[PDB]
Amino acid sequence: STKYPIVLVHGLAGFNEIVGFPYFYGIADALRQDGHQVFTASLSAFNSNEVRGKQLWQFVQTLLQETQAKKVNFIGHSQGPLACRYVAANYPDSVASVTSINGVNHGSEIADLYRRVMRKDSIPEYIVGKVLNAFGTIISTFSGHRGDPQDAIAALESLTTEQVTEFNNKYPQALPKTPGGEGDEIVNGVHYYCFGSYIQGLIAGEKGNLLDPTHAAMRVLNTFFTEKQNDGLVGRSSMRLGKLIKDDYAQDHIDMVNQVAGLVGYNEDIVAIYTQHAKYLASKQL
Ligand SMILES: [Ca+2]
Structure with a gap:
């Protein structure tokens, strides 16, 4: 079991309420079966990465008080690793490690395209239709066709390349120096690791999927990236942070959090x- 508690981090504070099960499907339960202490921070999706970082630091202070642990092990997905990076940069003494799973560490090309669509920036109607349809599909799958089919696209505003480049200028720690490279494993005493995936194979071979x-839907969105290797939301290169563990899983963005169900x-x-x-982290004395 890890020395420091594991905190799973993601955006969409309302997920469990709206969907009826956790965002990290099955994962905290599995971890607890292995003896680790595990908590989940579900952060506000419709605001900036710094707002989520501040929210996460408030949660971590409260958790460290309740555990008497001195540090946490973050495992974030998607939006999650940016907020984790904010906390590790600002409060390194409180953070043992940041593990990023398909984190949007250098921006999302599909958020970029939606911004070109939102702003009417000469994207052809057929592309607009396919992108909005794909978004709607994913939304409605999770919400049980309940509610708006575009609103939750507000989550992507903070995930564009422009926004994430600004964030990275503030919080550069552990980012790769060469695109498609790895970052430093330890920065300011905090361990950084990354995982990722990219869609592979023909769809008929996908099994459960x-x-x-x-x-x-993820496969439709994958076709609009310049980076061929992508998970439907983020390019493989953009996920990189700290030391690479494994990033060639044949999985879409939400497959990597065991979704849907x-x-x-x-x-x-x-x-x-x-x-x-989590066993690997425990082996590192974390
Ligand atoms: Ca899936």
């Missing part, structure tokens, strides 16, 4: 990525 309507690609054991890593 053939029952998950979000997968084909354990429907993932190729019979891969997503939860095992996390439990194996």
